[PDB]
Amino acid sequence: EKKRYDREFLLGFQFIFASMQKPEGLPHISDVVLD
Amino acid sequence: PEHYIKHPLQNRWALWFFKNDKSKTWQANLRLISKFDTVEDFWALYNHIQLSSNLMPGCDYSLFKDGIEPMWEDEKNKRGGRWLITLNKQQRRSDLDRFWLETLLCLIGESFDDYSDDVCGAVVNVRAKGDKIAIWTTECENREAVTHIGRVYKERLGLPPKIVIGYQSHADTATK
Ligand SMILES: C[n+]1cn([C@@H]2O[C@H](COP(=O)(O)OP(=O)(O)OP(=O)(O)O)[C@@H](O)[C@H]2O)c2nc(N)[nH]c(=O)c21
Description:
The structure holds two protein chains of two kinds.
Chain A: H1 7-11
Chain B: E1 8-18, E2 30-38, H1 39-46, E3 60-65, E4 81-86, H2 91-108, E5 119-125, E6 132-137, H3 143-157, E7 166-169, H4 170-175
Antiparallel strand pairs in B: 1-2, 1-3, 3-5, 4-6, 4-7, 5-6
The structure holds 7-methyl-guanosine-5'-triphosphate.
Protein name (chain A): Eukaryotic translation initiation factor 4 gamma 1
Region (EIF4E-binding) (chain A): 1-11
Family (chain A): Belongs to the eukaryotic initiation factor 4G family.
């Protein structure tokens, strides 16, 4: 089974806590990676 | 939260940034930002980076499947092409970020069904002459796949009649 998601499903996750944890290991790119 | 289960994507994706510096060879200006393979890790990245509409003219974002370089020369791109839309100056503030996000959702959500395997990635070019957004596919002569991706993409973007969409092979782009 392929993992397919519609837009409403995806948008529902934008602001859950797991989606607000800053990713680890990001490069320092000024005004691109918001620190 | 310590037991939360993320929602897996079909593919692992890499987000790239391009900085305009004409003193350097083109690929030297590419920067990998990060890779992800869940819905929540997509949003965690998106939520911590600048909007396309706020990038300096001459810069790009690209989202490509892991292992595909965001350039024509990659084995998975060299025989391929792009479905391209071009915006005008007014549309940067009103539509660029919305169209780019919708493009990202089409990619990570595998919205092209049995043709999503022909998708390589997508690119947003922030340009003074007109911003561009495109989905890159792997084979310009996979015409069933190219048709399906183009038709669904245009529907998902909800383009007005004034913003048209067309496909071009990378071979033709490179030769202008
Ligand atoms: C996507 N891409 C862009 N370039 C270089 O970047 C230049 C500009 O390519 P561009 O995609 O940034 O478009 P721009 O709007 O700036 O200008 P246009 O040419 O009028 O459409 C190309 O002419 C190439 O020199 C590329 N050069 C290589 N080697 N490979 C690529 O994949 C590639």
